[model samples]
Target: MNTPKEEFQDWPIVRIAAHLPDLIVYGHFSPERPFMDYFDGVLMFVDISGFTAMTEKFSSAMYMDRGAEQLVEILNYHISAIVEKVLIFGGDILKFAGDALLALWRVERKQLKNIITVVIKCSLEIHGLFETQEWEEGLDIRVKIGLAAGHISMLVFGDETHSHFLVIGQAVDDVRLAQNMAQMNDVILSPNCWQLCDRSMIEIESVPDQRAVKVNFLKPPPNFNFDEFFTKCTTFMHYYPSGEHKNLLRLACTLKPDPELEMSLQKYVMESILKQIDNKQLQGYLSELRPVTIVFVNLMFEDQDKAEEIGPAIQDAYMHITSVLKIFQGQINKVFMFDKGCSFLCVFGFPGEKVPDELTHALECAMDIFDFCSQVHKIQTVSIGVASGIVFCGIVGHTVRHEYTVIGQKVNLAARMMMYYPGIVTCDSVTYNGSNLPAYFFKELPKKVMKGVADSGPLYQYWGRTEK
Candidate 1:
């Protein structure tokens, strides 16, 4: 059950897992359950008309130097005000589709009425902001709102390691189409939203088109020219920041806009801002894929006071093991604790020039962690497994909360190898062969389908360092 404290901050924490693989450092969602689920409620789509024209005008005027950058800040400034309204009304929010922002309300079987009321409140506030404030002084940015309330779906999309969360439904489309139909400065509600709203606070009139929502413009400020500003634009002008100039100018001219022609090129300039964050401190939001080595470690607390006594034990193991890994230039990938004790996964050869025989470093690090445990009495023993393969790894999650993770089947098998053996170091064949381990020091574990991975793979138990 979600409480009010979890409202605005919760989704960002959940989204962190979506941004990068295995980056879920902290979350209440059950690890045993699937990441996909259903959402039932309202989605408010808010966008600015004349946004493309403004971007083009600013980009060209600014001489394309910081043109897109300056324009993005301007865009962010407006969206922040709208997002403020969204959070105040207890909504989940985000940026998407390059030109629009989304605010979602997960209502119940009976909360549609209140959701509709709150949606109206947010829409009106956003509308008032544009009309009252002389933002940009003839900036010609008009805010339009569209709303839908019904069943919607949320899922992890892309590789097994989620790159993003996709929300799909007729309601999602309904809200988008409604925004497109909305006249300058009007809120368009889908037929569904109209049915739930009480319609007494504001003057309610049937929208002319069956697809339209009931809406009216807020009274403009004294110096504003709503009639003339809206009349000059021939079509809605909006494009992604990464959009190509040819297609940008092309869509910049369309009457019936088709974003599907080439949307990825539509750049969200803010995506770059996400990368400046630090992954080492667990505050990163960037995601990318590359080849690497992953070493997973598990601690065994035989004289367990369970959590009370073991907390210090996990810390001791971490400090000593990390110090050892640092000597080998290994990076801690993620820290997912288990029922018995704790686990730490590390990686080498990523986000930098890939050094040859890096898996050799991972192997040496695992042995050092075991030796470190022997020297430290707090942690009695450790089991480590090393795997080398191409996996989707990145700094994932979002602001309010986010994480960095390395994810793939080989990464999967490494953790399994930890549970498959205790007080020993193990390696998948890929790591063993890649590092050119002594064949005589390794004995293949009997063939069986490895857990979590859908394959029958060979595993080798390390018999300590052998002759080169």
Candidate 2:
């Protein structure tokens, strides 16, 4: 098949960049700049729960129009409020993973104590909002905030054509661990964060067997004005100086439409996300719960440190994967890059209409991807997990750096199943039974117990394609 012709729109690049994560826009502002910057900051990881059950309720016959409109309405309502809180505290939102958010407050060593106090207060305010509010009757959504502090490594991956920014460090790892220890409506702090805060102003209790502590109450900083604090933080250009000042001139170049780069970005975004932009709803936050097939593809690298050699190979792999997905009409929901490797989330039905053969297409696409990656040089092994169910799909995050993502138990199930075995395609019963493909094409594995999975049933491994 010939390559598809390119068509670009007159998109307001600066406005779109304004909605991107600051680090990425900074990187894009200065083309081909490599970054492995370090900073001392406070990290906040907020995880919201109860959306899965709420989505399930919306799918039931009891609801009208599947409650898709109401679902997005409620999600954006709370997410925007949380984003506002983070910004007012001078924190930059890093990314939105499913229903969770990772934000950073970059401050000097002397300012660590002050930022930690405000970070705690920020979480308390967020927790208090949910403590009394409910999106719908009987649907109780809760927030768990995890706070940590210390040195953080900020790295940018990929070349000028496409790149992604990721934060990794002891503090980043601790934030997740601390968040894991938190209960519903609780604000947990890492040992590092707890130590940085003034104990006299806050009430805390230790989490069992963990270095994290739960905050019961925090005395708000008296006479503190967040508006002024936010201005002061930006006045120093904390996030701006990370890159060279010469890049400032390049920022204006974004004003004019760069159809080339705009088209390049769509290769990795979902069609539904692209459609919204076409509808001139770039700022519009849309979400819905829909039944679709979720496929998680993990490209593992034998050597993590060999970026010089594996970097190009990754780009090539992305091209191969995206092409295969396009052939089967699957959408690339999101791509996450790590030192170890990268993952591609392929959604078989979304951004448009549902198809009767979506399951078949998903399985075939997974098989196609595995067949290609198995022969690719430098790739250690490729694994895939497929599941079919209802997921809350929408554009999530602060406008500056949001993403189109799918969330629910099914998305989690597919991610967990992706690690089952390398060079193999593992799928849940929903996918296996739903596919028009015959049973002989799959080999049954023993029923295994999986965490977060309420009932573990027999899983299946795809053998290979067969003739009619």
Local accuracy of candidate 1 as per-residue lDDT tens digits, 1-468: 756532222222233222321111211233221234565778788765554455435535453555434555565566557655665455555333324566676667476765576577678877888886544565576778888888765432222211233354556657766776677678888887777765654455567757556666333345645335322211211121123323221111221223431121111112332334323333322333456787888776664323334454555566666577656567655453333435677777755435667877778778878767756655666888888875544432223212344445666678778877777888888878877867876767766565446562678776667533
Worst 10 residues of 2 by lDDT: 245-254
Which TM-score value belongs to model 2? 0.77
* Error of model 2, residue 82, in angstroms: 1.1
Clashes of 2: 4
Error of 1 at 251 (Å): 39
* lDDT measured at residue 104 in model 2 versus the true structure, 0 to 100: 83
Over 1-468, each residue of candidate 2 has an lDDT whose tens digit, in order, gives 889844332355644553455555444433432346667888899998877666667767776775766776677778878887776565777777777888888778777877787788789888878777776665478898889899876655444344555565668767877887888988889998888887866899878888789999865468767557545555544553224333332232234566865644443334455556667554344566778898899888765334444555556666677677767667666665422346777787774556668888888888888888878888887889889988888776545456666887888778767765557898888888888678899988776666556564668888777632
Reference-based lDDT, residue 30, model 2: 36
Q: What clash pairs does model 1 have?
A: 16-397, 240-266, 240-267, 241-267, 242-265, 242-266, 242-267, 243-265, 243-266
The residue pairs found clashing in candidate 2 are 19-399, 19-400, 19-401, 20-400
